[PDB]
Amino acid sequence: DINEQRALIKSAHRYISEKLEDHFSSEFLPKALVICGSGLSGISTKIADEPKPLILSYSTIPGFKVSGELIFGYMNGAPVVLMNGRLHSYEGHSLAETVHPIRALHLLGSINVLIVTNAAGGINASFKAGDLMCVYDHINFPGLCGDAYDLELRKLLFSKKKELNIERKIHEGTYSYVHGPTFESRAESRFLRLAGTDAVGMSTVPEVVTARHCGWRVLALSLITNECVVDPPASAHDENPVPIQEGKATHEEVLENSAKASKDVQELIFSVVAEI
Amino acid sequence: DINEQRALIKSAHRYISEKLEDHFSSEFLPKALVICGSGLSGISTKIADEPKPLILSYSTIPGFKSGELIFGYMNGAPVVLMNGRLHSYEGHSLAETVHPIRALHLLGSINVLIVTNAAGGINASFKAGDLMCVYDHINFPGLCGFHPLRGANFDEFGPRFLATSDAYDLELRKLLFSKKKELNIERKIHEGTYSYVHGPTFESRAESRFLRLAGTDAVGMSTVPEVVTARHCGWRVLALSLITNECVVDPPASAHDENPVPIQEGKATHEEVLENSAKASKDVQELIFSVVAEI
Amino acid sequence: DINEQRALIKSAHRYISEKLEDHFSSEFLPKALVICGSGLSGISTKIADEPKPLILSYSTIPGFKGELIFGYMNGAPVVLMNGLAETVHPIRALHLLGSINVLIVTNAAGGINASFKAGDLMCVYDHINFPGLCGFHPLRGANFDEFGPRFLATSDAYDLELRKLLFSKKKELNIERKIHEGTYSYVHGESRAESRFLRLAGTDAVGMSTVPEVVTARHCGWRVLALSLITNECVVDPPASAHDEAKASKDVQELIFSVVAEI
Ligand code: HPA
Ligand code: HPA
């Protein structure tokens, strides 16, 4: 509640460390935490089968909530943690419950980089569904009412795009974190554009802030899954109106476009973790 | 927490359903819920006298909370009147504010929400006494965590992720202007963006200026949480704002101005809001009375 | 809940009023409450030694969470509080004395206007209550009707005459430190894009204080004079692209010292 949180963090670390003590023949000290958001659902298959990876369900780790698992293993030669299943503020969870896995994993003392992906709506007018955005700055709107993105890791991400011959666009710009769970209205998207937003999403920024608070480097990659509707709605005086449902955002579209970009995103992250 | 507003919603649904069952000879399936905000306090007198309308006090409905539900026929159509609404600046949560919408949704007949409210004019072309038909909104508190859908999703009502670019039905807005011409109403009816702020303070000049550049046409203290909840239930929405005052947006008098305009000039007041809402009430009454017959 | 909040306000005033009676020979009716922000707490040295000032720790005042200083400075009786319903409970408690008419609040603020430098002063003549627009508001809940209105205007929050007074006192005191007139944006919890957004919204200085106290004082009918100390210029320019190769406290002290004598 006030200090039970710290005991909960210590308790979860005791569990994870003791499980890493039984599973791995040698000391497993992960250097990267990969929050497998959109586009990273299948990167767990890129974990090496040997040494056999350790899979911890959230139900057994103290403090970890559900409504999820931790994967400890080697990817591209480097030891990493993948957390499949993330908590969101719009689901009712508190900010502490959302970033509790990061604070527990930080007690291992070996992780020094957070790599996180998420879906995002395109606010920048030149953005198209299917593009990626490397985040170099953010606006925390919920934090407003109650850099941080490592330059070398961003340089590294673009070098791996060239090395892998990935044709997919990867922009640079600002990511606005909003609470959700509603998609933005037309006037809200226009406001976000005026505020300097390039893409908008409802996750990631709280984990980034906690990761920076723990001294970790951060690399954040947004998947532009849709282009936010910005045009004013059809006037009642228009005899030939554009239907107000045309181009509406949809979770099915977010899911489909996340999966379409997953092969490129997983290849980029797999190449990056070898040089963390 | 999801399991106990579900229990509260279903409990409130039966209490309304059972007393709709005893009161009306023919079963009462209302087409619309009319939130009687500013300009609609008197529309209860437009309810047809037969069949006998049913009035349910909030104090006797589980989960609810001045305040009553009026079940009757208006211009031939069965409706529910929300006479008295909960505001968030009074300390109530958003879940308590929109709980009547979810409970009334279980009647399975309502597919349109008609809601009015008072609003300060941010658009410079707006005058006190004008009306604004809402076709878009800015939910700035929702962007920052003050959202009526926060928490576990009511999967039986709507999707976890809800679009709002289609929030304000076009056919209902055209029907509203069609009734303005039919009734020969000369009052101005604009079409613009409504911004929901928490209150209970009136906006400072810098807050009104910020809302203006953000794209606001009129700023109010209610409605948007109910519109979002109704849209989550799949309802069509017709929102109508009453421009009760013109927001002070010019920067305040500077200390080095030797011909300063008094900073207290044109300040907003609750009495001006009340009196302008009353003056426009007859027009708003007539408009909603005609619209309900064609929803 | 308001019933218990009302009793705690009365208890705090009943304690404060009783202590003023025992301490001061002549009855003490303070005319201004001066809130001393961080780094600007040394203003307590500007209170006259005679009559003897009264210092009440917050821990001794019922309902409070720092110290309250009751004394005379420049001949005027004032209250100094050295250091959301909790934050403004002291304002409503002190209002029950029936004498305070002015709130003078000072704070440290980050510079959003590009023309500001660290060390500059800014006289607040407008604010943006971001938390209040979203739900974190000092007046949320049942209204204190005995204190003020359910709906309060904020377009007349920063008294013009009190601002004209401050500027007059700077010329008199030959203070050369620049004093700007601008908007203070209140944020509860910045990035370059966040600082850029504030500038686009009309922010001249940003911080996490002042505004809730200003609203509560305005709800009580007080006049408000707000002064900000620019401690740093918030960076606004975007970060590098992956493709490229303390003396002001005495100045504030002199200003408040000269202002309180002619409020
Ligand atoms: O349009 C959007 N809005 C908010 N969050 C999102 N996440 C993916 N797309 C979107
Ligand atoms: O100026 C206003 N601001 C906010 N809400 C309002 N409701 C009526 N007028 C106003």
> Which class is B2-292 in CATH?
alpha beta
Cα dihedral B155/B158/B162/B166 (nearest 10): 170
Q: Which amino acid is at C11?
A: S
Phi, psi dihedrals of residue A11, rounded to the nearest 5°? -65, -45
C240/A contact by beta carbon, under 8 A: yes
Closest by Cβ to C130, choosing from A139, A145, A157: A145
Which residue's CA lies nearest to atom 1 of ligand 2? B120
Q: Return the residue of B nearest to A188 by Cα.
A: B138
**What is the 3 state secondary structure string of chain B?**
CHHHHHHHHHHHHHHHHHHHHHHCCCCCCCCEEEECCCCCCCHHHHCCCCCCCEEEEHHHCCCCCCCEEEEEEECCEEEEEEECCCCHHHCCCHHHHHHHHHHHHCCCCCCEEEEEEEEEECCCCCCCCCEEEEEEEECHHHHCCCCCCCCCCCCCCCCCCECCCCCCCHHHHHHHHHHHHHCCCCCCEEEEEEEECCCCCCCCHHHHHHHHHCCCCEEECCCHHHHHHHHHCCCEEEEEEEEEEECCCCCCCCCCCCCCCCCCCCCCCHHHHHHHHHHCHHHHHHHHHHHHCCC
**CATH of region C2-260, choose from 3.30.70.1380, 3.40.50.1580, 3.40.50.11540, 3.90.1210.10:** 3.40.50.1580
CA of A262 to the centre of ligand 2 (A): 47
Q: Which residue, A95, A70, A123, A119, is CA-closest to A5? A: A95
Question: What architecture is the A4-273 domain classified under in CATH?
Answer: 3-Layer(aba) Sandwich (3.40)
C135/B contact by beta carbon, under 8 A: yes
Q: Per the structure block, which two tokens stand in for A34?
A: 């990969």
Euclidean distance between CA atoms C146 and B5, whole angstroms: 36
Q: Which residue, B65, B85, B101, is CA-closest to B232? A: B101
C164/B contact by beta carbon, under 8 A: yes
CB C81 within 8 A of CB C36: yes
Euclidean distance between CA atoms A106 and A100, whole angstroms: 10
Q: Per the structure block, which two tokens stand in for A275?
A: 């040089």
Contacts of residue A194, Cβ cutoff 8 Å, sequence gap at least 6: B213, B214, B215, C200
With CB atoms and an 8 Å threshold, state whether B138 touches A182: no
Place of tokens 């476009």: A257
Euclidean distance between CA atoms B96 and C162, whole angstroms: 43
Q: Which amino acid is at B258?
A: E
Q: Return the residue of C nearest to B221 by Cα.
A: C133
Euclidean distance between CA atoms C245 and B53, whole angstroms: 76
**HSE of A14, CA atoms in CB hemisphere, 13 A:** 8
**Which partners does chain C have (≥3 C-beta pairs < 8 Å)?**
A, B
Euclidean distance between CA atoms C100 and C91, whole angstroms: 10
Euclidean distance between CA atoms A51 and A27, whole angstroms: 12
> What angle, rounded to 10 degrees, do the helices at B94-105 and B224-232 form?
40
**HSE of A43, CA atoms in CB hemisphere, 13 A:** 37
Closest by Cβ to A195, choosing from C200, C239, C243: C200
* Eight-state DSSP code of residue A127: -
Place of tokens 């600046």: B89
- For chain A, breaks with the C atom over 2.5 A from the next N come after 67, 146
Peptide bond into B51 cis (omega under 30): yes
The nearest CA of chain C is from the CA of A148 a distance in Å of 8
C123/B contact by beta carbon, under 8 A: yes
Q: Using alpha carbons only, give the angle C248, C156, C123 rounded to the nearest 5 degrees.
A: 15
Mapped onto helix, strand or coil, the DSSP state of residue A195 is coil
Contacts of residue A126, Cβ cutoff 8 Å, sequence gap at least 6: none
CB C189 within 8 A of CB A140: yes
What's the residue count for chain C? 263
* Eight-state DSSP code of residue A241: P
Q: Return the residue of C nearest to A157 by Cα.
A: C242
- Ordered by start, the domain boundaries in chain A are 4-273
Euclidean distance between CA atoms A268 and B242, whole angstroms: 54
Closest by Cβ to B143, choosing from A179, A247, A251: A179
How many CB atoms neighbour CB A231 within 10 A? 12
CB C232 within 8 A of CB C125: no
Encode B138-167: b = buried (16+ Cβ within 10 Å), e = exposed. bbbbbbbbbbbbbbbbbeeebbbbbbbbbb
The sign of the CA dihedral A224, A230, A233, A239 is: negative
Q: Which residue, C88, C132, C85, is CA-closest to B200? A: C132
- For residue C104, list its beta bridge partners: C34, C225
Q: Is B277 in the pocket of ligand 2 (CB under 6 A)?
A: no
Distance from chain centroid for Cα B85: 9
A94/B contact by beta carbon, under 8 A: no
CB A53 within 8 A of CB A73: yes
B272 is in an annotated binding site: no
CB B217 within 8 A of CB B123: yes
Q: Which amino acid is at C118?
A: A
Q: Which residue, A91, A108, A128, is CA-closest to A30? A: A108
CB A187 within 8 A of CB B215: yes
Residues of C in contact with A136 (CB under 8 A): 238-239, 241-242
Phi, psi dihedrals of residue A266, rounded to the nearest 5°? -65, -35
Q: Which of A134, A144, A272 to mutate to test the interface with C (most CBs of C within 10 A)?
A: A144
Euclidean distance between CA atoms B167 and B229, whole angstroms: 11
Q: Which amino acid is at C50?
A: E
Place of tokens 């005319």: C31
Distance from chain centroid for Cα C233: 21
C187/A contact by beta carbon, under 8 A: yes
Q: Return the residue of B nearest to C166 by Cα.
A: B255
Encode B38-60: b = buried (16+ Cβ within 10 Å), e = exposed. bbbbebbebbeeeeebbebebee
Q: Per the structure block, which two tokens stand in for B226?
A: 């109910």
Q: Is B246 in the pocket of ligand 2 (CB under 6 A)?
A: no
Residues of B in contact with A181 (CB under 8 A): 147, 149-150, 153, 160-162
B259/A contact by beta carbon, under 8 A: no
Which residue's CA lies nearest to atom 1 of ligand 1? A121
Q: Return the residue of C nearest to A137 by Cα.
A: C193
CB C224 within 8 A of CB C35: no
Test site for ligand 1: of A123, A204, A228, A230, most ligand atoms within 8 A of the Cβ: A228
Distance from chain centroid for Cα B21: 28
How many CB atoms neighbour CB C231 within 10 A? 19
Q: Is A214 in the pocket of ligand 1 (CB under 6 A)?
A: no
Euclidean distance between CA atoms A253 and C15, whole angstroms: 63
With CB atoms and an 8 Å threshold, state whether A244 touches B170: yes
Which whole-number Å values give the CA distances from A12 to A5, A63, C23, in the listed order? 10, 7, 56
Euclidean distance between CA atoms B17 and B35, whole angstroms: 19
Test site for ligand 1: of A86, A133, A226, A256, most ligand atoms within 8 A of the Cβ: A226
What's the residue count for chain B? 295
Bridging pattern class, strands B32-35 and B77-83? parallel
Q: Which residue, C146, C25, C35, C58, is CA-closest to C96? A: C146
CB A249 within 8 A of CB A120: no
Cα dihedral C162/C163/C166/C172 (nearest 10): -110
**Which partners does chain A have (≥3 C-beta pairs < 8 Å)?**
B, C
Euclidean distance between CA atoms A263 and B232, whole angstroms: 34
Distance from chain centroid for Cα B169: 15
Q: Is B82 in the pocket of ligand 2 (CB under 6 A)?
A: no
Q: Is B113 in the pocket of ligand 2 (CB under 6 A)?
A: no
What's the residue count for chain A? 276
State the method. Answer: X-ray
Distance from chain centroid for Cα A12: 22
Cα dihedral A68/A69/A75/A81 (nearest 10): 100
* Eight-state DSSP code of residue A248: -
Closest by Cβ to B161, choosing from A146, A183, A187: A183
**HSE of C235, CA atoms in CB hemisphere, 13 A:** 8
Burial class for C21, CB neighbours closer than 10 Å (0-12, 13-18, 19+): exposed
Euclidean distance between CA atoms A35 and A45, whole angstroms: 15
CB A215 within 8 A of CB B172: no
Q: Which amino acid is at B273?
A: V
Which residue's CA lies nearest to atom 2 of ligand 1? A121
Phi, psi dihedrals of residue A213, rounded to the nearest 5°? -65, -30
How many CB atoms neighbour CB B257 within 10 A? 11
Phi, psi dihedrals of residue A145, rounded to the nearest 5°? -125, 40
Bridging pattern class, strands B236-246 and B131-138? antiparallel
Q: Per the structure block, which two tokens stand in for A161?
A: 């795009």
C140/A contact by beta carbon, under 8 A: no
Q: Which residue, C202, C210, C166, C169, is CA-closest to C186? A: C210
Closest by Cβ to C128, choosing from B210, B256, B260: B210
Test site for ligand 2: of B116, B130, B244, B269, most ligand atoms within 8 A of the Cβ: B244
Euclidean distance between CA atoms B24 and B53, whole angstroms: 8
Burial class for A36, CB neighbours closer than 10 Å (0-12, 13-18, 19+): buried
CB B122 within 8 A of CB A123: no
CB B180 within 8 A of CB B189: yes
Q: Return the residue of A nearest to C201 by Cα.
A: A195
**What is the 3 state secondary structure string of chain C?**
CHHHHHHHHHHHHHHHHHHHHHHCCCCCCCCEEEEECCCCCHHHHHCCCCCCCEEEEHHHCCCCCCEEEEEEECCEEEEEEECCHHHHHHHHHHHCCCCCCEEEEEEEEEECCCCCCCCCEEEEEEEEEHHHHHCCCCCCCCCCCCCCCCCCCCCCCCCHHHHHHHHHHHHHCCCCCCEEEEEEEECCCCCHHHHHHHHHHCCCEEECCCHHHHHHHHHCCCEEEEEEEEEEECCCCCCCCCCCCCCHHHHHHHHHHHHHCCC
* Eight-state DSSP code of residue A182: B
Euclidean distance between CA atoms A263 and B8, whole angstroms: 46
CB A86 within 8 A of CB A37: yes
Q: Is B268 in the pocket of ligand 2 (CB under 6 A)?
A: yes
Q: Which amino acid is at C84?
A: L
* Eight-state DSSP code of residue A231: S
Euclidean distance between CA atoms A72 and A81, whole angstroms: 5
**HSE of B31, CA atoms in CB hemisphere, 13 A:** 11
Contacts of residue C176, Cβ cutoff 8 Å, sequence gap at least 6: none
